[PDB]
Amino acid sequence: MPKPYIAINMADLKNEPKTFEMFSAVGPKVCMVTARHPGFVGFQNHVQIGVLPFGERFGGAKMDMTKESSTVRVLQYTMWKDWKDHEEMHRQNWSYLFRLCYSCASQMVWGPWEPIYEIKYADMPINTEMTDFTAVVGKKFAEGKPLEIPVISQPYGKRVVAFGEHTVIPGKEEQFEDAIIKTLEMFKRAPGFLGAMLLKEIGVSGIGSFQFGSKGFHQLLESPGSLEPDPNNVMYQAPEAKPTPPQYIVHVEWANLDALQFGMGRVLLSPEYREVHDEALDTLIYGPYIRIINPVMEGTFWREYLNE
Amino acid sequence: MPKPYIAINMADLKNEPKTFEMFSAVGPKVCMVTARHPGFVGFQNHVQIGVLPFGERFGGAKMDMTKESSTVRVLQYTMWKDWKDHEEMHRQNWSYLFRLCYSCASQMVWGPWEPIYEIKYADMPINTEMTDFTAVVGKKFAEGKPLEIPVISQPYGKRVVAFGEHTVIPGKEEQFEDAIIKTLEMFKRAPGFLGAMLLKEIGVSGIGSFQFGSKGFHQLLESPGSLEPDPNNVMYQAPEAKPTPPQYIVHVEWANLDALQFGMGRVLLSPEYREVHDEALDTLIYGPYIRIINPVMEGTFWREYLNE
Amino acid sequence: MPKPYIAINMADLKNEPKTFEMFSAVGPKVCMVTARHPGFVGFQNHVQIGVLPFGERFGGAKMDMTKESSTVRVLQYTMWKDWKDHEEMHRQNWSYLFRLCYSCASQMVWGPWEPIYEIKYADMPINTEMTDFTAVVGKKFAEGKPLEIPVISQPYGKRVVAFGEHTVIPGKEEQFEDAIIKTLEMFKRAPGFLGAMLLKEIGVSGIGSFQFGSKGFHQLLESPGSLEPDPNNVMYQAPEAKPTPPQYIVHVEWANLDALQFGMGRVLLSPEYREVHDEALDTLIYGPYIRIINPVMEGTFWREYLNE
Ligand SMILES: [Fe+3]
Ligand SMILES: [Fe+3]
Ligand SMILES: [Fe+3]
């Protein structure tokens, strides 16, 4: 393939400018340190901008709430050949990593929380800018491979993502994955559709969530910023935190907020779609809660790996 | 005893005034409808006002964020002789209950989510106003029972609550409960301490979380406000949603935000306390995240039941 | 008993908000680090708010000068089973301690200066909130110990302290302690009186005063904030700095600024009081200079130790 493993770092921060300033200054440094490991294959950092309302099921929400929200959630995707690589980068580069993610403590409201995911399905294209399409069309014809010419999925904040949260009834996992996967395939008929993938949580990176034992806890709260908590003081292993009921993420990319709204809305507006999707809805404990997120900074080459 | 069962309804809403207006108008109606069932024994509704920062682990947060937050979370405690009573009140009084909780859809950002809890430990006194203490002191002396004279835990928004979230490593449950319980006992030496209880999640009320199957989902999103989703379209039973890893709530009441800050802070500042509590910290997957919440509207008589 | 040993950290800082912000962020961290030692038994941090004027002996001063002062003095009390424990906590946890107290260099005008004291007399009760008194009255009657029911000394900034400085003529030490001790006993007849204690300086913690030899001095002034001066470069031992003439602190707690003003003023207004106190006044080289200070953050359990 290969389908890499995905770690998603989640945090809530003050939606003021000091926050975006720090992002601008250390976001880069952290991603550079994460690239010190050969298992690292790329990333996709998102900033949550809104919530899909579903009519008025969520009246206080809108797809773009950036102008009215007091906090902002980030969702940072790091891709790995093997999820154990992730844990090991965290351990190897702890003094940089930690002193770095602390500088933004003054802005933290919740987090960090870094669950680990495995990919059940993935239909994600290589990101191209509108300037590349002539040569992409020219290369594929040159090798007689027109079917390999994809939609133009623009990188660096020029497309939106629907990030849907689902918790499944135990024993219902197969019906759910099957119905969702087929929904994501039918989504290819929708205009503005840039790809999607089903994600399944297989554990939580305790060290990435700043979750240590009694000792680490204390160095965490007592830290001046220039000393790290003992990284070996993480009391559990990623898999020990695999949750039951099972938890999924239906990640779907769209051209714009309307393509997203009416494309997804398809499982609600098209009888054909709506009947396949109702099966997924019969297996749910929680969901679907859909966050609208923006792929701001990324290393689009993780996709080069996904498609080898 | 009896230790009742506790259901905690959680929702995030726009922190504007239209929201508090609706609260003022339907909160009453909902609680009245919940009292149509004999299993109902009282309630405790909280509004989240802040977050315990732990120094600057959570720099963007403070114990009182009511002036700067764009959303507000409520935590409504309903008490039951038996948790099955709760599910049955929801079912019996669905047309009122549902049409009622919808009127506040226009203000919803997330929720409702109503997990069910069982009490592992409970040291909660009967709420008294400063005007009652003369007679409470007089009655107990009259029966030669001075030890039964409690601290004055004022009702209706005149005390704060620390609402701590903990997720425990599987197999570590006994060490955690034991260390926490003994911490809550040592907390009686702290000034301003009004009581506490350890809560353990045993499932989720799907009907209280507006979690139906394909069919209900659709009536939920298509509702004009005057029609309910089929309540029998809830696809799972509360216990099927018992989570692993195990999830707890260390609910601790204090006289004020400082008594809370330095009382709890005791597991950090007092060597005696700090060593007992470190054991709880060794069993954690998540936590402790502490929300400061305000017991605004309540039916203090649920406590009369807890202490029989 | 036991009468613990007391170390009092003194510093002058800019009375602007950046200062109180840092207090809010690192004060907690420092006290947490100080609790890593079993000799630590609690603390009492004060912020100076004013000066007792004595009529118009000090005309430019008032009991509350917080609105007009450009600097602010803090007086942080840490309690120890044995004063050597204090020196050893400083040494053991130097990298945290130091990098922590530096972050507030940008706000320092003078200090740190941490003299060590021994208690000659102590009449300090356990701090209770107005919510605890019903149960305190109920427990003591339950054991037939009404004399053990104390005044309500509220914690966390809800009472004032008179911090009086006295330097005694050598050879006059006994007359002074005897007259002062009896004054503090007569003070129990004054309304609003919450306790007191006579303090005697027995040395200075050079490491707590950032007082090193040539070498440390240099690392102190050259520090980027992420490196500590050699802690073994402290050239003297606490006792070598015991001062002659002898220096005392008459620490007296009151309900409010008026109870303090007229309670103390008693050694001036009541003939009975005034004649006992005149003897203390005959042994003085310096004093009495009385600072009004506010017990803002504390670990009231140090008092649990004092009264065992
Ligand atoms: Fe990570
Ligand atoms: Fe309910
Ligand atoms: Fe010190």
User: How distant is the Cα of A111 from the closest Cα of chain C, in angstroms?
Assistant: 18
3-state class percentages of chain C: helix first, strand second, coil last, to nearest 5: 35, 30, 35
* C-alpha A7 – ligand 1 centre gap (Å): 6
Q: CB B108 to CB A58 under 8 A? A: yes
C99: nearest CA partner in chain A:
A224
Furthest-apart CA pair in chain A: how many Å?
62
Instruction: Label residue C222 exposed, middle or buried (CB < 10 Å: 0-12, 13-18, 19+).
Output: exposed
| CB contact set of A2 (below 8 Å; sequence gap of 6+) | A81, A305, A306, A308
The DSSP secondary structure of A227-253, one letter per residue, reads SPPPGGG--S-GGGG--BS-EEEEEEE
- Reported as type and span, the H/E element at residue A291 is strand A284-298
Structure resolution in Å?
A: 2.7
* C-alpha C209 – ligand 3 centre gap (Å): 8
- Residue A290 structure tokens: 């859909």
Q: How far apart are CA B274 and CA B272, in angstroms?
A: 6
The angle formed by the CA atoms of residues C148, C151 and C155, to the nearest 5 degrees, is 115
| CB contact set of B261 (below 8 Å; sequence gap of 6+) | B52, B63, C156
**Angle between helices B94-102 and B17-34 in degrees, nearest 10:** 170
Asked how this structure was determined, the answer is X-ray
Contact list in C for residue A226 (CB cut-off 8 A) is 99, 225-226
- Residue A209 structure tokens: 């969530």
Instruction: Supply the DSSP symbol for C139.
Output: H
Burial state string for B258-282 with b = 16 or more CB within 10 A and e = fewer than 16: bbbbbbbbbbbbbebbbebbbbbbb
Q: How far apart are CA C79 and CA C6, in angstroms?
A: 5
The DSSP secondary structure of B121-139, one letter per residue, reads EEE-PPP--TTTHHHHHHH
User: How distant is the Cα of C298 from the closest Cα of chain B, in angstroms?
Assistant: 7
Instruction: Label residue C92 exposed, middle or buried (CB < 10 Å: 0-12, 13-18, 19+).
Output: middle
- Residue C64 structure tokens: 């509350």
| CB contact set of A51 (below 8 Å; sequence gap of 6+) | A58, A61, A62, A63, A65, A289, A290, A291, A292, B109, B110
Q: Are C199 and C122 in contact (CB under 8 A)?
A: no
What three-state secondary structure class fits B190?
coil
C86 annotated as a binding-site residue: yes
Number of residues that make up chain C: 308
C141: nearest CA partner in chain B:
B146
C114 annotated as a binding-site residue: yes
Q: How many CB atoms lie within 10 A of CB C79?
A: 24
CA torsion B6-B12-B17-B22 (nearest 10°) is -50
User: How distant is the Cα of A227 from the closest Cα of chain B, in angstroms?
Assistant: 14
Q: How many CB atoms lie within 10 A of CB A17?
A: 8
Q: How far apart are CA C169 and CA C173, in angstroms?
A: 7
B275 annotated as a binding-site residue: no
CA contacts within 13 A on the Cβ side of B61: 25
Q: How far apart are CA C280 and CA C168, in angstroms?
A: 9
Count of pairs with CB atoms under 8 A, one residue in A, one in C:
27
Q: How far apart are CA C97 and CA C77, in angstroms?
A: 16
Q: CB B245 to CB A240 under 8 A? A: yes
Cα B26 to Cα A230, B20, B32, C223, distances in angstroms: 51, 10, 10, 60
Strands A160-168 and A115-123: unpaired
A204: nearest CA partner in chain B:
B285
* C-alpha B272 – ligand 3 centre gap (Å): 20
The angle formed by the CA atoms of residues C217, C20 and C92, to the nearest 5 degrees, is 40
Sorted by where each begins, the domain ranges of chain C are 1-308
Burial state string for C287-305 with b = 16 or more CB within 10 A and e = fewer than 16: bbebbbbbbbbbbbbbbbb
Helices in chain B by DSSP H: which ranges?
A: 17-34, 83-92, 94-102, 133-142, 173-186, 214-222, 257-264, 266-269, 271-281, 302-306
Provide the strand spans (E) within C18-138.
40-51, 71-80, 108-113, 115-123
Number of residues that make up chain B: 308
* C-alpha C114 – ligand 3 centre gap (Å): 6
Instruction: Supply the DSSP symbol for C228.
Output: P
Contact list in B for residue C156 (CB cut-off 8 A) is 256, 258-259, 261-262
* C-alpha C184 – ligand 3 centre gap (Å): 28
